[PDB]
Amino acid sequence: CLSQYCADKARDGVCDEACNSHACQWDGGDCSLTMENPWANCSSPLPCWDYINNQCDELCNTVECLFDNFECQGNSKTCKYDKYCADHFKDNHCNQGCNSEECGWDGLDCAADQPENLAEGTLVIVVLMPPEQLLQDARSFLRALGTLLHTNLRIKRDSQGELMVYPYYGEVAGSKVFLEIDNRQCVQDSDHCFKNTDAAAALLASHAIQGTLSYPLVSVVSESLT
Ligand SMILES: [Ca+2]
Ligand SMILES: [Ca+2]
Ligand SMILES: [Ca+2]
Ligand SMILES: [Zn+2]
């Protein structure tokens, strides 16, 4: 890459930080959930991967540039009643104190009679949790990724109505899960909802690059076919 060390280490299933660079394709994707270039669609004159700096850079504040990692939001708020809200997230009861962007809009419990407003495409994620553990922890998994993406996610269902969670056999037992983004509330409160899953996948990869992911994700891909 930049080195012969990085050539050797690329795509070996381990993030090597000496190679965690745009030039080295984030260690052949080892550090970026296998995504070679999360900013491939970004037409900013800035190398936006260098501007994850806790400061607003407007040149990177577009969807294809990953909204500058949401660093152009001014009021960088967290969920005030995070403990209460986590336990009441997606529990089929509207908790008004949790009905805000920071709290993932109570997992859409307060928007139950509102039409779905799906982003185009499907997020395909491999996580190092076996299917049973993922299914049992699905609400927390969805809340965490939703919080990262500033929207609401759900596990996709197949045409039998079954949740699309499948065993994935690697060196560690994992799962492959298919997710959809529901913007039904996001669009009302936010100017930065993903209209398509491509940039959402890339933002997850970006968080992998930084090491700020809350769950042990292995890979993410945005699909239009599924
Ligand atoms: Ca590596
Ligand atoms: Ca920035
Ligand atoms: Ca609730
Ligand atoms: Zn936001």
XYZ file of C-alpha atoms and ligand atoms in Angstrom:
230
model
C 0.000 0.000 0.000
C 1.991 2.900 1.442
C 4.247 0.126 2.722
C 5.027 -3.549 2.086
C 3.859 -4.207 5.669
C 0.369 -3.110 4.673
C 0.409 -5.316 1.565
C 1.053 -8.298 3.865
C -1.646 -7.378 6.374
C -4.477 -6.417 4.001
C -7.715 -8.434 4.209
C -6.524 -10.869 6.907
C -9.510 -10.428 9.235
C -7.639 -8.170 11.678
C -7.574 -4.352 11.787
C -3.953 -3.138 11.724
C -3.960 0.571 12.593
C -0.683 1.301 10.758
C -2.673 0.454 7.630
C -5.980 2.032 8.684
C -5.757 4.681 5.990
C -7.605 5.763 2.839
C -4.422 4.966 0.877
C -4.448 1.402 2.270
C -8.216 1.010 1.770
C -8.537 0.841 5.594
C -6.330 -2.242 5.856
C -7.981 -3.944 2.836
C -11.351 -3.471 4.581
C -10.274 -5.133 7.839
C -10.983 -1.844 9.658
C -14.041 -0.792 7.652
C -16.438 -3.787 7.786
C -14.954 -4.906 4.427
C -15.943 -1.634 2.717
C -12.997 -0.500 0.603
C -14.180 3.113 0.188
C -17.017 4.473 2.372
C -16.505 7.893 0.708
C -16.533 6.536 -2.882
C -19.635 8.607 -3.712
C -18.400 11.770 -1.920
C -17.701 14.685 -4.287
C -16.364 17.053 -1.621
C -13.083 18.864 -2.380
C -12.015 17.692 1.099
C -10.763 14.199 1.970
C -13.752 13.800 4.293
C -12.225 10.775 6.097
C -9.631 13.202 7.500
C -12.340 15.533 8.839
C -13.866 13.301 11.540
C -12.714 15.847 14.119
C -15.705 16.759 16.347
C -16.073 19.999 14.347
C -18.512 20.949 11.570
C -17.035 20.875 8.075
C -19.749 21.953 5.622
C -17.833 20.667 2.591
C -18.422 17.199 4.057
C -21.993 17.803 5.297
C -23.778 15.894 2.505
C -25.312 12.385 2.428
C -22.646 10.934 0.103
C -19.928 12.359 2.364
C -21.756 10.807 5.352
C -22.991 14.166 6.717
C -19.499 14.792 8.105
C -20.133 12.050 10.714
C -23.049 14.161 12.034
C -20.569 16.809 13.267
C -22.749 19.609 11.828
C -25.607 19.158 14.313
C -24.686 21.895 16.821
C -26.776 20.663 19.750
C -24.960 17.342 20.212
C -27.527 15.862 22.583
C -27.814 12.411 24.147
C -30.991 10.680 25.358
C -31.702 12.406 28.693
C -33.469 9.395 30.230
C -31.347 6.792 28.432
C -31.889 4.020 31.024
C -35.686 4.475 31.134
C -35.873 4.974 27.376
C -33.727 1.921 26.484
C -36.028 -0.337 28.559
C -39.150 1.213 26.984
C -37.836 1.301 23.396
C -40.113 -0.503 20.936
C -42.379 -1.865 23.691
C -45.658 -1.054 21.887
C -46.424 1.880 24.202
C -45.774 5.549 23.400
C -43.321 6.989 25.921
C -43.372 10.716 25.172
C -40.159 11.450 27.093
C -38.386 9.122 24.632
C -40.041 10.453 21.474
C -37.111 12.404 20.045
C -34.200 11.912 17.659
C -31.672 11.316 20.491
C -33.880 8.549 21.895
C -34.609 7.000 18.465
C -38.244 8.192 18.671
C -39.144 5.458 21.179
C -38.573 2.853 18.438
C -41.634 4.174 16.545
C -44.031 3.371 19.436
C -45.459 6.921 19.092
C -45.880 6.643 15.307
C -47.812 3.345 15.168
C -50.661 4.673 13.001
C -48.261 6.456 10.625
C -47.417 5.016 7.146
C -43.966 3.478 6.773
C -41.464 5.622 4.918
C -38.690 3.264 3.916
C -35.289 4.199 2.562
C -34.521 2.407 -0.690
C -32.450 -0.771 -0.284
C -31.450 -3.224 2.457
C -28.539 -3.214 4.927
C -26.820 -6.598 5.085
C -24.788 -7.027 8.262
C -22.663 -9.829 9.666
C -22.305 -9.680 13.483
C -20.347 -11.975 15.774
C -23.381 -13.061 17.804
C -25.182 -16.338 17.072
C -28.765 -15.961 15.698
C -30.410 -16.798 19.039
C -28.441 -14.128 20.951
C -29.072 -11.530 18.222
C -32.831 -12.254 18.120
C -33.101 -12.038 21.911
C -31.178 -8.738 21.941
C -32.775 -7.354 18.785
C -34.242 -4.236 20.409
C -30.909 -3.074 21.859
C -29.162 -3.936 18.579
C -31.714 -1.864 16.614
C -31.552 1.040 19.130
C -27.754 1.192 18.969
C -27.528 1.178 15.179
C -30.487 3.575 14.934
C -28.742 5.951 17.360
C -25.588 5.811 15.188
C -27.551 6.459 11.971
C -29.981 9.037 13.495
C -33.019 7.093 12.251
C -35.098 3.970 12.914
C -34.179 0.474 11.776
C -36.070 -2.825 11.759
C -35.100 -6.393 10.902
C -36.438 -7.219 7.439
C -39.008 -10.029 7.140
C -39.196 -12.546 4.289
C -42.448 -13.271 2.463
C -43.429 -15.837 5.130
C -43.172 -12.992 7.688
C -40.023 -14.496 9.214
C -37.170 -12.306 10.493
C -34.214 -12.389 8.123
C -31.553 -13.542 10.604
C -29.388 -16.479 9.483
C -26.473 -18.352 11.065
C -23.118 -17.348 9.638
C -20.323 -19.810 10.209
C -16.891 -18.264 10.580
C -14.099 -18.694 13.145
C -16.581 -17.233 15.630
C -20.303 -18.094 15.414
C -22.146 -15.175 13.901
C -25.328 -14.085 12.184
C -26.180 -12.392 8.940
C -29.034 -9.935 9.387
C -31.017 -7.909 6.877
C -32.253 -4.480 8.009
C -34.461 -1.749 6.583
C -34.437 1.972 7.448
C -37.876 3.427 8.304
C -37.720 7.221 8.038
C -41.367 7.758 9.010
C -40.360 9.964 11.979
C -36.838 10.957 10.920
C -38.072 13.091 7.969
C -40.312 15.159 10.255
C -37.568 16.149 12.707
C -34.383 15.897 10.662
C -32.866 17.241 7.442
C -30.378 14.340 7.353
C -32.301 11.087 6.821
C -30.913 8.456 4.434
C -33.071 8.151 1.323
C -31.090 5.066 0.383
C -29.081 2.458 2.361
C -25.738 3.030 0.570
C -24.599 5.958 2.740
C -25.949 4.314 5.923
C -23.733 1.254 5.295
C -20.793 3.569 4.665
C -21.383 5.467 7.916
C -21.362 2.187 9.867
C -18.042 1.389 8.119
C -16.773 4.846 9.074
C -17.597 4.117 12.726
C -15.743 0.828 12.394
C -12.715 2.814 11.123
C -12.886 5.040 14.253
C -13.463 2.069 16.572
C -16.723 3.514 17.930
C -19.097 0.665 17.059
C -21.217 -0.703 19.942
C -21.681 -4.214 18.496
C -19.150 -6.628 17.006
C -20.033 -6.049 13.330
C -17.868 -7.938 10.763
C -19.247 -6.593 7.494
C -21.895 -4.354 6.025
C -23.178 -4.145 2.475
C -26.018 -2.078 1.018
C -28.143 -4.117 -1.411
C -30.739 -3.085 -4.001
C -31.519 -6.701 -4.991
C -32.174 -8.764 -1.800
Ca -5.215 -6.485 8.406
Ca -15.893 17.344 10.727
Ca -42.123 2.814 24.177
Zn -29.496 13.835 13.717
